Design a protein around this ligand. Structure first.
Ligand code: HEM
Lengths: 5, 385
């Protein structure tokens, strides 16, 4: 879970 | 399978908040073997991670993790390496005219919802939210929208899925591929900019910012655009769904017993889309009575922390008049959201326009997207009124 766009 | 938290489990994806609550009650700082990370479920500890870059880094290269192509960017560096890009973007963003944006959006929402009122029923996610937020983000940045064929939704799905790659290793390469595709779109934009908007300002503001015009700035612009598109659509679908599923809540907004000001904030706290923000521990630290070692990853579960009863009385209830409401929906610190003002205009404009159709009601079962990091729906069947 890495909030990366 | 994890004894306490399986974020891609369908039963958890249907409703993660009871799992969050139980996890926070039993192991507020919990070692998750599968995600290979500590999970923080408490508002005080998430804020502490988010505020301390020297001790919790987004640059996972600092714990010997190579950053894949397309991913070294504004989001994946810390000060001072990040501060030039952060300042270039902050300047480019503050140079914009938000009233012009708000007004053009209000015309657009009102027209879109009179169109959808003509139908028997429609899907709020694909027929309103996605159309609306894509208009919002391309107008704000100053570019011509991409074409929304099935290949676009396919790259979007891969990129979203790629955020959960630690739990599904086959998701990584399609996310890089998808992010490269949108970099090819960003390069086009930067290589022939239009006259106004955030992206023209970046090109104009480069000389002497300290930022080179390379793939790092390109990856940064892609992430600005993709977050600007998807995250508000995730929010709009969660918000309207919660209002209709919560008895009395829409009636409260329709009657005007509460303002959009406290209501929109409470909607962000309750069902904000961002669920996790990960960081790399650069120095041994104690959190929640647990020794977090240098080299380990920690994850702020801000969706869980926004329902922390230590911070919010009656945290599991949608109280549209909540005050104060110190939610973490938009993050904190060096990496806090650059679009929060655009986010809130979209939410006030969308909600203001729906309140023109007081008889709005569900027309089917919502469907939850199979994502854990960034939570939203893939359909919300509705009929207007
Ligand atoms: C309701 C909608 C939105 C929510 C809930 C939201 C939430 C967040 C959160 C929690 C972060 C922190 C990430 C971290 O700490 O690593 C963030 C960062 C960011 N947001 Fe938003 N966001 C929204 C909409 C937008 C929009 C509309 C834009 C652009 C127009 C945008 C651009 C960004 C960027 C570029 C960052 C990265 C900042 C950095 O790494 O320094 N977001 N957002």
């Amino acid at each position: 879970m890495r909030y990366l766009h | 399978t994890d004894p306490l938290f399986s974020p891609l489990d369908p039963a958890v994806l249907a409703d993660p908040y009871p799992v969050y609550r139980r996890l926070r009650e039993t192991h507020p700082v919990y070692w998750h073997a599968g995600l290979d990370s500590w999970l923080m479920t408490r508002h005080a500890d998430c804020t502490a991670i988010l505020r301390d870059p020297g001790r919790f880094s987004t640059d996972f290269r600092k714990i010997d993790i190579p950053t894949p192509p397309t991913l070294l960017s504004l989001q994946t560096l810390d000060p001072p390496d990040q501060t030039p890009l952060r300042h270039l973007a902050l300047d480019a963003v503050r140079a914009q005219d938000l009233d012009a944006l708000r007004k053009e959006l209000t015309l657009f929402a009102d027209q879109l919802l009179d169109e959808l009122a003509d139908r028997e029923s429609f899907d709020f996610i694909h027929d309103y939210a996605d159309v609306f937020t894509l208009r919002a983000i391309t107008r704000f940045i100053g570019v011509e929208p991409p074409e929304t064929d099935e290949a676009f939704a396919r790259f979007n799905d891969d990129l979203d899925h790629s955020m959960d790659a630690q739990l599904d290793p086959d998701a990584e390469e399609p996310g890089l591929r998808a992010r490269a595709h949108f970099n090819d779109l960003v390069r086009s934009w930067l290589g022939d900019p239009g006259p106004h908007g955030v992206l023209p300002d970046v090109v104009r503001l480069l000389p002497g910012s300290g930022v080179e015009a390379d793939d790092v700035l390109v990856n940064s612009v892609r992430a600005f655009f993709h977050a600007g598109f998807e995250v508000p659509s995730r929010f709009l679908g969660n918000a309207l769904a919660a209002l209709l599923a919560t008895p009395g809540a829409w009636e409260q907004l329709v009657r005007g017993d509460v303002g959009l000001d406290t209501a929109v904030e409470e909607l962000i706290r309750y069902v904000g889309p961002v669920q996790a923000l990960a960081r790399a521990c650069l120095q041994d630290t104690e959190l929640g009575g647990m020794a977090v070692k240098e080299g380990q990853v920690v994850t702020a579960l801000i969706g869980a922390a926004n329902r922390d009863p230590d911070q919010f009385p009656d945290p599991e209830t949608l109280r549209l008049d909540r005050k104060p409401n110190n939610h973490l929906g938009f993050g904190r610190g060096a990496h806090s959201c650059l679009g929060l003002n655009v986010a809130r205009i979209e939410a006030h404009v969308t909600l203001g326009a729906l309140l023109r159709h007081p008889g709005v009601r569900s027309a089917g079962e919502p469907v939850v997207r199979p994502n854990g990091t960034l939570r939203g729906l893939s359909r919300l069947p509705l009929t207007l009124g």
